[PDB]
Amino acid sequence: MDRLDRKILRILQEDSTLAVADLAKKVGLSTTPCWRRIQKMEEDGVIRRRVALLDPVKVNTKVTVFVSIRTASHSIEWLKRFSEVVSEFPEVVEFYRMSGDVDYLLRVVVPDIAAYDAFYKRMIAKIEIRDVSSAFAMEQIKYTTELPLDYML
Amino acid sequence: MDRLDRKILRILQEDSTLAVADLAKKVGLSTTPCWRRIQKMEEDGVIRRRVALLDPVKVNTKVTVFVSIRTASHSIEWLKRFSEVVSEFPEVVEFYRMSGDVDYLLRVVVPDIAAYDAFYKRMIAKIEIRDVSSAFAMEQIKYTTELPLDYML
Amino acid sequence: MDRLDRKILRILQEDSTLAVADLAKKVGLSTTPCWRRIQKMEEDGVIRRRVALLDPVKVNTKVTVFVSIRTASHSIEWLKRFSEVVSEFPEVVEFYRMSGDVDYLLRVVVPDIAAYDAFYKRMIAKIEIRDVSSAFAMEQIKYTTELPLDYML
Amino acid sequence: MDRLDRKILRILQEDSTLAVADLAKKVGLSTTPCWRRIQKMEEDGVIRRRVALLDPVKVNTKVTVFVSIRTASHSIEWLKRFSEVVSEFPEVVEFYRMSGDVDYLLRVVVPDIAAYDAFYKRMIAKIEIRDVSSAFAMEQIKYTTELPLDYML
Amino acid sequence: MDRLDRKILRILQEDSTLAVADLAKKVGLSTTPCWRRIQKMEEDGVIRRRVALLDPVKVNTKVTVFVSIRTASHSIEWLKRFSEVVSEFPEVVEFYRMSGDVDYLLRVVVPDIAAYDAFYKRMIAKIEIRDVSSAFAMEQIKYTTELPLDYML
Amino acid sequence: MDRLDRKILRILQEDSTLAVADLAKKVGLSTTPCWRRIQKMEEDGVIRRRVALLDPVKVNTKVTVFVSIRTASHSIEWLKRFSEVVSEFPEVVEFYRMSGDVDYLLRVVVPDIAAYDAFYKRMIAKIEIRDVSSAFAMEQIKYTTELPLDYML
Amino acid sequence: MDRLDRKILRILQEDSTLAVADLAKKVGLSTTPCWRRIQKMEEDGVIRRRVALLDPVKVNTKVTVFVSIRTASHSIEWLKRFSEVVSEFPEVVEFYRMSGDVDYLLRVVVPDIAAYDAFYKRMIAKIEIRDVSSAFAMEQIKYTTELPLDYML
Amino acid sequence: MDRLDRKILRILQEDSTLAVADLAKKVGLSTTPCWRRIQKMEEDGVIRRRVALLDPVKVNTKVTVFVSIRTASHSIEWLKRFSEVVSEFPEVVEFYRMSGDVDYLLRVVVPDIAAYDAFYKRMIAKIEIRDVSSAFAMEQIKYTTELPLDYML
Ligand SMILES: [Ca+2]
Ligand SMILES: [Ca+2]
Ligand SMILES: [Ca+2]
Ligand SMILES: [Ca+2]
Ligand SMILES: [Ca+2]
Ligand SMILES: [Ca+2]
Ligand SMILES: [Ca+2]
Ligand SMILES: [Ca+2]
Ligand SMILES: [Cl-]
Ligand SMILES: [Cl-]
Ligand SMILES: [Cl-]
Ligand SMILES: [Cl-]
Ligand SMILES: [Cl-]
Ligand SMILES: [Cl-]
Ligand SMILES: [Cl-]
Ligand SMILES: [Cl-]
Ligand SMILES: [Cl-]
Ligand SMILES: [Cl-]
Ligand SMILES: [Cl-]
Ligand SMILES: [Cl-]
Ligand SMILES: [Cl-]
Ligand SMILES: [Cl-]
Ligand SMILES: [Cl-]
Ligand SMILES: [Cl-]
Ligand SMILES: [Cl-]
Ligand SMILES: [Cl-]
Ligand SMILES: [Cl-]
Ligand SMILES: [Cl-]
Ligand SMILES: [Cl-]
Ligand SMILES: [Cl-]
Ligand SMILES: [Cl-]
Ligand SMILES: [Cl-]
Ligand SMILES: [Cl-]
Ligand SMILES: [Cl-]
Ligand SMILES: [Cl-]
Ligand SMILES: [Cl-]
Ligand SMILES: [Cl-]
Ligand SMILES: [Cl-]
Ligand SMILES: [Cl-]
Ligand SMILES: [Cl-]
């Protein structure tokens, strides 16, 4: 909405644990107006939720695999059911319908190659797909849930 | 650590706003032991942080671009500086060193093609790269920050 | 036909608004012979039509997408109907049957990625196609309707 | 601007030869208001120009080649000069800076393969380019200079 | 067979018009032994035939197209009939069953792109093929019917 | 030139061994006019030469390899010298400057993979080339030196 | 198991012909404890077998071909039978289910291209496969059956 | 050499542990002639060595990676040193100079993705390579050191 909302969101995306009175002080605001701004943004759905982010090394999901899918020609309903069943897998953490050479791109997290192999077998039992090409990440250099706020309007 | 820690984490990854006494009740625990478990997991870094997640449509970052990079042969220090300068861009929300045909995979968020074009010009002024191939997402079907907890050990 | 016809066409391809008497003077001709040359070229179909060209930024069609299609094996009649239904789309501004890896190449104009996504859904409801690979233009550096006239014979 | 402007433009893109009084009647308007609308659209640059379109078979430019270019890493000024020198070629009728695997896409028109070969030699004397991949069209199924007007706003 | 046979063949592959007595002198042989060597090589089929070679520019077949074919899975009999019907086309001057990404490679000669287009339509009416990718030669730098004779044994 | 010349050429491309009097009878001509037609076609270079064609299995050159080359950017003189040195190799029986993904296509004949390996080492000592991709033929289904004569004009 | 087991295995992987008393001396052990360690490793299956390794040049299997296979979508049982029938071929010396663009990778040994061609025909009679791409090795630079022992644990 | 040598080798490739007297009985031979045949084959190098084969799961090298390398143009000596330094790595168990799109193919064994990542860093410190594309095996379906003996001659 305005520049003060942006200052609030910039901190909230980094850390939602601050007492609302300490966030207020960090953004140059009294407590009530700060709280009221946050409430409006929650109601409007700008802030969609607040979550704990876990360490993938510590919950044993340290490998990222990017799975590239090509589909055959299919009805709007088949695509709706294909994307519902891929979405149910807890290991599929991101799922995109792409343009370009590939139809869908998934990001999958698992502890190791063998865990990936067994995930893939469960996936492929439930769907049918012309071509799957999996690519394993060697390192996660950056992963953030912070959006760029320079474009807000 | 144990199965009760998993029940706690499963809720925390979905919603970190609950009062600790209400989370306790949802996991079958008294309040203090629940709190003490959460504290241990924070100290140990299993829980790395708690954050607000924003709606990309509402902060004007609705387009996702997957940028595939190939590099020339370079020193361990060049790769260290290349990955530091790509990491600074607020639009680069995910950044992986890959195995396979592509050296690096970025996920970039922007409002539109023109915003992507201008991001790309800023990136390429700061780095040098044999080949960049960008692919635009048509739809984000799933995006979650919840890790699968079935592998915890 | 001859070199004076070429001088006439070179101007007409740039600007068809000139009074025929001013075009005559610009090509070194009296008015009637100039007019008579233009008439012959219209009758013969060398000049096929005269049109207004609009600014794509101002009519909200600023994104160009090049859509690469591969088809299955099909009858001469299926190809005739496939190309008739793709041709009806007002967004398909150019459409070629190609040689090489790709069977067909389309140029599509739309305001944005979302408009492209919805165009693609309408297209794909009406046709069936093994593989579509879309590539978005970052910039239109040159677009002219002027043909090279150095080869005329 | 409004729906009557759209009706005017829809005809103008098809045929700019009509007397303004006959266009008026076709769009449900008196002559002066029709003329005044057209003038505004010219002044504003919505209508950028009016041109004769020629028959490529009759001016001996019947072959279309789509030329895909990849460049090395280069300064913003090199790209500015590269695109100025490619733009000067009368055979390069369309020229795009692309996203995806290819850096630039050209559409080139010539009478035959040999004319293409000689064009290519002239181009490559003047520029330096990692990779050029040319693809010849077998047929031009549709070519229009009419933009879709459904998106106007 | 021996080194004198090789000297004979080296000339015969270049020019079969010489009187047998002049070939004899050029290879250091009397006429009868030279003739008798040539006869043996014809009978044994080392020399398979003698032919006129024509100038492709002068018989209006100046364009070479290399056609890469991929087939579906098929019976040994389907492949036998597919290769018999492709072989009948007078424009298919060379035809290979390949290893690697492509199943078959053809060399086709025609006067121009349009002649190629019409050849392709006739071919594809008679066969069914997953993928055809045609590539046009810009120049024939070397074409010889002379085999290397350094390996003879 | 005319249809009788075509009848003559159709036989000559198959077999140049016939006495001119027997060819005459096969084409419906007296001997002298037949001879005179053949002479004209030789003088004009329509018939470029007459050669013995040998059996590749019998001269120990039974393997065909198609070698795909990509070059860097180079002067018109470098390309002239590159193509002169590749042309000298007796194993390079066909050599084309291509359009498309590949810059040059060679057809190479050798007895076996090891002979190919040693040819490749000699070639690469003498030239420098970004990318060579070799593909081995499994079978030569058709190889003819007969051009299609349906296009003659 | 421990570092002395590693010293034993490092020699055994190189040469299993030594009398157990000479191996003992080479690893710093008395004979019985050395023997007892070897027995334990056989019983546990760390040592799976001892074999003669033959020279491929001397048994006429000097060509290596890497065969890349893509399959259609198939049941867990079809994949089980496909992999059983490919496994029976004595020429298929290594066989992997891959991730990435290719579904399976085989290493095949034969004397020559023709032997490969005939192997391929036998394979393809028994299985059905969307795409096979074969690549021939020019040289075997290293081939060892020794595993790296630095990771043992 | 002969069919009895083949019977001996067929067993030796499977199991070299048999007492020579028991192998003799299995091949239909008295002991001395069997021994003498084996000695000849060792002296001639048909049998190159006898080795223990270990279980990759039990020595913690359970992941196979196929590493595809492309090199720049280089001297015969650079290629000699490149292949010597890649050969020294104990994890590179197979190493081939290839024909086709890829210059070299390696088979690498490691316990996991992280071990592969660290191997790759050591390799790339010691060599310079245009392009490396790694592909991870999901399963080793067959791995044998037995050559096909049907081609022996
Ligand atoms: Ca796959
Ligand atoms: Ca690009
Ligand atoms: Ca697509
Ligand atoms: Ca090219
Ligand atoms: Ca095609
Ligand atoms: Ca190569
Ligand atoms: Ca193949
Ligand atoms: Ca790589
Ligand atoms: Cl949400
Ligand atoms: Cl919330
Ligand atoms: Cl697409
Ligand atoms: Cl929170
Ligand atoms: Cl963190
Ligand atoms: Cl926290
Ligand atoms: Cl890699
Ligand atoms: Cl957009
Ligand atoms: Cl006009
Ligand atoms: Cl028209
Ligand atoms: Cl007109
Ligand atoms: Cl084609
Ligand atoms: Cl303009
Ligand atoms: Cl105008
Ligand atoms: Cl890009
Ligand atoms: Cl042409
Ligand atoms: Cl023959
Ligand atoms: Cl003959
Ligand atoms: Cl193959
Ligand atoms: Cl002759
Ligand atoms: Cl000649
Ligand atoms: Cl001649
Ligand atoms: Cl090209
Ligand atoms: Cl071979
Ligand atoms: Cl075993
Ligand atoms: Cl054993
Ligand atoms: Cl995969
Ligand atoms: Cl042994
Ligand atoms: Cl050895
Ligand atoms: Cl031995
Ligand atoms: Cl190669
Ligand atoms: Cl792993």
**Residue E4, φ and ψ in degrees, nearest 5:** -70, -35
Contact H138 G97 (CB under 8 A): yes
CA A53 distance to own-chain centroid: 11
DSSP labels, A6-74 = HHHHHHHTT-S-S-HHHHHHHHT--HHHHHHHHHHHHHTTSEEEEEEEE-TTTTT--EEEEEEEE--S-
Structural domains of chain C in order of their starting residue, each with its CATH number: 2-53 (1.10.10.10), 54-137 (3.30.70.920)
D45 touches C58 (CB < 8 A): yes
Annotated binding residues of B:
100, 103, 132
Q: Which token pair is B137?
A: 């997402």
At what resolution in Å was this solved?
Answer: 2.3
For residue A143, the one-letter residue type is Y
Nearest Cα neighbor of H90 from H71, H68, H106 is H106
Measured CA to CA, the distance from residue C2 to residue C28 in angstroms comes to 14
Residue of C nearest to B135 (CA): C135
**Residue H88, φ and ψ in degrees, nearest 5:** -70, -25
Smallest Cα distance from F110 to chain D, Å: 30
Helix (H, G, I), strand (E, B) or coil at B137: strand
H152 touches chain G (CB under 8 A): yes
CA of G98 to the centre of ligand 7 (A): 18
C23 touches D114 (CB < 8 A): no
Residue of D nearest to E120 (CA): D138
Q: How many CB pairs under 8 A join F and H?
A: 15
Helix (H, G, I), strand (E, B) or coil at F75: coil
Measured CA to CA, the distance from residue F107 to residue F92 in angstroms comes to 6
- For G70-82, b/e burial (b = at least 16 CB within 10 A) is bbeeeeeeebeeb
Contact C121 A73 (CB under 8 A): no
Between residues 16 and 75 of chain C, which touch chain E (CB distance below 8 Å)? 70, 73
A115 touches chain B (CB under 8 A): yes
Smallest Cα distance from B138 to chain C, Å: 6
Q: Which token pair is B82?
A: 């290349």
B130 touches chain D (CB under 8 A): yes
CA angle B68, B70, B72 (to 5 degrees): 165
Q: Which token pair is A41?
A: 């943004």
What are the residue ranges of helices labelled H in chain G? Answer: 3-12, 20-27, 31-43, 76-88, 113-126
Tell me which residues have their CB within 5 A of the ion that is ligand 28: E 16, 50; F 16, 50
Annotated binding residues of G for Ca(2+):
100, 103, 132
Contact E143 F59 (CB under 8 A): no
- DSSP assignment letter at C15: -
Name the CA radius of gyration of chain F, rounded.
Answer: 20
Query: Which residues fall within 8 angstroms of residue F40, CB to CB, at 6 or more apart?
Result: F1
Contact C135 A100 (CB under 8 A): yes
Helix (H, G, I), strand (E, B) or coil at F112: coil
* Chain B environment of A99 (Cβ under 8 Å): 135-138
Helix (H, G, I), strand (E, B) or coil at F28: coil
Q: Which token pair is C114?
A: 């979302």
A133 touches chain G (CB under 8 A): yes
Helix (H, G, I), strand (E, B) or coil at B31: helix
Strand residue runs (E) in chain B: 47-54, 63-70, 92-98, 104-110, 131-143
Contact E99 G129 (CB under 8 A): no
CA of C107 to the centre of ligand 21 (A): 20
| CB nearest B133 (choices: D73, D76, D100) | D100
Annotated binding residues of B for Ca(2+):
100, 103, 132
Contact F138 G113 (CB under 8 A): yes
Q: Which of A61, A136, A139, A140 to mutate to test the interface with H (most CBs of H within 10 A)?
A: A136
H1 touches G40 (CB < 8 A): no
* Chain H environment of G110 (Cβ under 8 Å): 148, 151
Query: In chain H, which residues are last before a break of more than 2.5 Å from C to the next N?
Result: none
The ligand with the least distance to the CA atom of G70 is 1
Q: Tokens 């663009």 sit at which residue?
A: G101
Query: Which residues fall within 8 angstroms of residue G86, CB to CB, at 6 or more apart?
Result: G92, G95, G104, G106, G123, G127, H141, H142
Helix (H, G, I), strand (E, B) or coil at C2: coil
For residue A16, the one-letter residue type is S
**How was this one solved?**
X-ray
Q: Which of H101, H132, H141 to mutate to test the interface with G (most CBs of G within 10 A)?
A: H141
Angle between helices C3-12 and C20-27 (to 10 degrees): 130
Is chain D adjacent to chain F, meaning 3+ CB pairs within 8 angstroms?
A: yes
CA F55 distance to own-chain centroid: 15
CA of B111 to the centre of ligand 16 (A): 7
The ligand with the least distance to the CA atom of A67 is 35
Sequence length of chain H is 153
F4 touches F27 (CB < 8 A): yes
G94 touches chain F (CB under 8 A): no
Measured CA to CA, the distance from residue C99 to residue H51 in angstroms comes to 55
Measured CA to CA, the distance from residue F147 to residue E57 in angstroms comes to 11
C-alpha distances (whole Å) from E30 to each of C70, E22, E27, E38, E68 are 64, 10, 9, 13, 49
Helix (H, G, I), strand (E, B) or coil at F27: helix
Query: Which residues fall within 8 angstroms of residue G11, CB to CB, at 6 or more apart?
Result: G18, G23, G26, G27
CA C133 distance to own-chain centroid: 21
G149 touches H59 (CB < 8 A): yes
Smallest Cα distance from E136 to chain C, Å: 9
Contact C66 D93 (CB under 8 A): no
Specify which residues F132 forms β-bridges with: F69
| CB nearest D47 (choices: C54, C100, C115) | C54
G127 touches chain H (CB under 8 A): no
Measured CA to CA, the distance from residue F99 to residue F87 in angstroms comes to 19
A110 touches chain B (CB under 8 A): yes
B136 touches chain C (CB under 8 A): yes
Specify which residues F139 forms β-bridges with: E97
Q: Tokens 């165009």 sit at which residue?
A: C119
Measured CA to CA, the distance from residue C49 to residue F101 in angstroms comes to 37
The ligand with the least distance to the CA atom of A47 is 10
The ligand with the least distance to the CA atom of A145 is 13
Q: Which of D123, D127, D131, D136 to mutate to test the interface with F (most CBs of F within 10 A)?
A: D131
Smallest Cα distance from H45 to chain G, Å: 7
Helix (H, G, I), strand (E, B) or coil at H17: coil
Contact G135 E73 (CB under 8 A): no
Contact B136 D99 (CB under 8 A): yes
G146 touches H61 (CB < 8 A): no
CA of E67 to the centre of ligand 20 (A): 7
Task: Encode H21-88 in three state secondary structure.
Answer: HHHHHHHCCCHHHHHHHHHHHHHCCCEEEEEEEECCCCCCCCEEEEEEEECCCCCHHHHHHHHHHHHH
Measured CA to CA, the distance from residue A105 to residue A69 in angstroms comes to 6
E99 touches chain G (CB under 8 A): yes
CA of D45 to the centre of ligand 27 (A): 58
- For F24-62, b/e burial (b = at least 16 CB within 10 A) is beebebeeeebeebbeebeeeebbebbbbbbbbebbbbb
Measured CA to CA, the distance from residue B128 to residue D72 in angstroms comes to 10
Element spanning F36, H or E: helix F31-43
Contact G96 H138 (CB under 8 A): yes
Annotated binding-site residue? E5: no
B112 touches chain A (CB under 8 A): no
Nearest Cα neighbor of E103 from E135, E64, E131, E134 is E131
Measured CA to CA, the distance from residue D85 to residue A138 in angstroms comes to 42
C-alpha distances (whole Å) from B68 to each of B92, B133, B141, E46, G3 are 12, 5, 21, 55, 44
* Chain A environment of B55 (Cβ under 8 Å): 45-48
CA B150 distance to own-chain centroid: 20
CA of C69 to the centre of ligand 3 (A): 9
Strand residue runs (E) in E6-118: 47-54, 63-70, 92-98, 104-110
